[PDB]
């Protein structure tokens, strides 16, 4: 069933016991922290075996 990705992440915030408005009011910070954290996986795997 399709759902917009920010609304799926708001359901996942409810699943950890954080209210949905915490995601919608911080959405750009949460997206940046995710994009940054994937960049660290990329760098660590690029760095060492």
């Amino acid at each position: 069933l399709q759902i917009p990705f920010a609304m799926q992440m708001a359901y996942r915030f409810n699943g950890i016991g954080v209210t949905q408005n915490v995601l919608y009011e911080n959405q750009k910070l949460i997206a940046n922290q995710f994009n940054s954290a994937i960049g660290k996986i990329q760098d660590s795997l690029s760095s060492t075996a």
Binding site: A6, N21, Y24, Q27
Partner: protein, 56 residues
């Protein structure tokens, strides 16, 4: 506890796993801050059931 949904002309709230549309009200919903922050927020009426009761 639900998701906001539209049939094209009207806005409802439903439970997430089964389509059961209800009118959007001050007891179906909670407030947090102003309209300027949320990406993709929409303008619609929220009905307040107390106001016609005070109008009795």
């Amino acid at each position: 506890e639900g998701v906001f949904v539209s049939n094209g002309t009207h806005w409802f709230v439903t439970q997430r796993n089964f389509y059961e549309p209800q009118i959007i009200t001050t007891d179906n919903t909670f407030v947090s801050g102003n309209c300027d922050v949320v990406i993709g927020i929409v303008n619609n009426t929220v009905y307040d059931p107390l106001q016609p009761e005070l109008d009795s």
